[PDB]
């Protein structure tokens, strides 16, 4: 791999800084094959219940270094919890900590994204194509938690990612999920009626809906205080553009020829009732915040529910708020739902399950390590 996942961790704060300073001494000048077989052996040697734990995921020898220097000077200042999800490092003293789940949806690609430099086109997703392939990665990063037997309090998925969402949490098996996503893919790609898409706004939702007011668009995807995306015909879209320019709210096109989460998303309801109904739904067993219903799923009946998701908007913003967790991993392919949440001021990092570089795969693990959600990285180490 790309990144080496290096763990360990000691019954307390003095002990582990011993620890460390020894670990430091030692990574000194280790080729990456040393380096691997010390990684390699440390997650064998600090596995099971281990009270204060260090987590991170490194280049090589000198990042090993860099980030035993800072985990160090933060134990030295008295400090018992360091989580840098963007450096892929995790310091935890006194945990477990609280573990969230994000399970992201298909990609929010800008049309025009400049370039010149805008102070000085994109194709959308193929959504019946790309609804199947996103759900398939977060079912294989939902095989990779249950290997690790991970113990998060609860999840959240946006738009499509429901779906896996509710694969974690029991109420539908891989399979079936899987092609309940072709299913809807394949809904959700027919055309619109009129030609219609979606324009991201750099504001709040109140903001939003008096831009939107009297245009005809409709909020689709709520993400926070500083994304809100509304949808509609081009006509609408273009309302609000020339409402945003008066207001002086930067709202930028996206590469979609659907407004997704809108009421022109009807006839793909429909359609995908059609598919849900047919399947053996159970109830729940593990937490979910929906961004259907802005709540935590309670009894429900998932027909309705992923009918409505469609036409209805995305909850991203009430659904984390929700979500009481000091640290969120994104179990999905990309960096989608981290990039939201931390917009949102969260701390989350993604496992980037499918990609090329194991970079999330060694930084989502060091989190859920560090975090106490998980008790042994030897997984990590095999079969490579
Ligand atoms: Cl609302």
């Given at each position: 791999?790309?990144?080496?996942?290096?763990?360990?961790?000691?019954?307390?704060?003095?002990?582990?800084?011993?620890?460390?300073?020894?670990?430091?001494?030692?990574?000194?000048?280790?080729?990456?094959?040393?380096?691997?077989?010390?990684?390699?052996?440390?997650?064998?040697?600090?596995?099971?219940?281990?009270?204060?734990?260090?987590?991170?995921?490194?280049?090589?020898?000198?990042?090993?270094?860099?980030?035993?220097?800072?985990?160090?000077?933060?134990?030295?200042?008295?400090?018992?919890?360091?989580?840098?999800?963007?450096?892929?490092?995790?310091?935890?003293?006194?945990?477990?900590?609280?573990?969230?789940?994000?399970?992201?949806?298909?990609?929010?690609?800008?049309?025009?994204?400049?370039?010149?430099?805008?102070?000085?086109?994109?194709?959308?997703?193929?959504?019946?194509?790309?609804?199947?392939?996103?759900?398939?990665?977060?079912?294989?990063?939902?095989?990779?938690l249950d290997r690790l037997g991970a113990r998060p309090v609860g999840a959240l998925g946006?738009?499509?990612?429901?779906?896996?969402?509710?694969?974690?949490?029991?109420?539908?098996?891989?399979?079936?999920?899987?092609?309940?996503?072709?299913?809807?893919?394949?809904?959700?790609?027919?055309?619109?009626?009129?030609?219609?898409?979606?324009?991201?706004?750099?504001?709040?939702?109140?903001?939003?809906?008096?831009?939107?007011?009297?245009?005809?668009?409709?909020?689709?995807?709520?993400?926070?205080?500083?994304?809100?995306?509304?949808?509609?015909?081009?006509?609408?879209?273009?309302?609000?553009?020339?409402?945003?320019?008066?207001?002086?709210?930067?709202?930028?096109?996206?590469?979609?020829?659907?407004?997704?989460?809108?009421?022109?998303?009807?006839?793909?309801?429909?359609?995908?009732?059609?598919?849900?109904?047919?399947?053996?739904?159970?109830?729940?067993?593990?937490?979910?915040?929906?961004?259907?219903?802005?709540?935590?799923?309670?009894?429900?009946?998932?027909?309705?529910?992923?009918?409505?998701?469609?036409?209805?908007?995305?909850?991203?913003?009430?659904?984390?708020?929700?979500?009481?967790?000091?640290?969120?991993?994104?179990?999905?392919?990309?960096?989608?739902?981290?990039?939201?949440?931390?917009?949102?001021?969260?701390?989350?990092?993604?496992?980037?399950?499918?990609?090329?570089?194991?970079?999330?795969?060694?930084?989502?693990?060091?989190?859920?390590?560090?975090?106490?959600?998980?008790?042994?990285?030897?997984?990590?180490?095999?079969?490579?």
């Amino acid at each position: 791999p790309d990144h080496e996942l290096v763990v360990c961790g000691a019954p307390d704060a003095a002990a582990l800084t011993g620890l460390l300073t020894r670990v430091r001494a030692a990574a000194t000048a280790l080729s990456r094959p040393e380096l691997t077989d010390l990684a390699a052996g440390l997650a064998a040697a600090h596995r099971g219940d281990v009270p204060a734990r260090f987590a991170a995921a490194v280049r090589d020898a000198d990042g090993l270094v860099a980030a035993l220097d800072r985990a160090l000077g933060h134990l030295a200042e008295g400090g018992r919890r360091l989580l840098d999800a963007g450096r892929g490092l995790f310091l935890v003293v006194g945990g477990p900590l609280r573990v969230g789940l994000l399970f992201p949806g298909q990609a929010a690609p800008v049309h025009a994204d400049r370039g010149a430099l805008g102070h000085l086109p994109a194709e959308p997703v193929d959504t019946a194509v790309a609804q199947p392939a996103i759900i398939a990665d977060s079912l294989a990063g939902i095989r990779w938690l249950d290997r690790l037997g991970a113990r998060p309090v609860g999840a959240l998925g946006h738009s499509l990612g429901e779906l896996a969402a509710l694969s974690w949490a029991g109420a539908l098996d891989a399979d079936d999920t899987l092609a309940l996503a072709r299913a809807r893919g394949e809904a959700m790609s027919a055309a619109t009626e009129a030609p219609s898409g979606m324009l991201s706004l750099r504001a709040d939702l109140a903001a939003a809906r008096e831009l939107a007011a009297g245009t005809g668009a409709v909020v689709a995807v709520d993400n926070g205080e500083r994304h809100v995306v509304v949808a509609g015909t081009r006509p609408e879209l273009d309302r609000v553009a020339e409402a945003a320019r008066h207001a002086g709210i930067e709202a930028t096109p996206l590469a979609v020829s659907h407004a997704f989460h809108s009421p022109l998303m009807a006839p793909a309801a429909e359609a995908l009732r059609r598919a849900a109904g047919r399947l053996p739904w159970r109830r729940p067993e593990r937490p979910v915040a929906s961004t259907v219903t802005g709540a935590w799923w309670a009894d429900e009946d998932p027909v309705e529910v992923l009918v409505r998701q469609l036409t209805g908007p995305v909850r991203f913003r009430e659904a984390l708020g929700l979500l009481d967790a000091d640290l969120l991993v994104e179990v999905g392919p990309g960096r989608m739902l981290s990039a939201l949440a931390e917009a949102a001021g969260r701390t989350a990092v993604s496992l980037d399950a499918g990609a090329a570089s194991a970079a999330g795969m060694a930084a989502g693990t060091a989190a859920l390590f560090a975090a106490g959600a998980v008790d042994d990285a030897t997984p990590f180490f095999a079969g490579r």
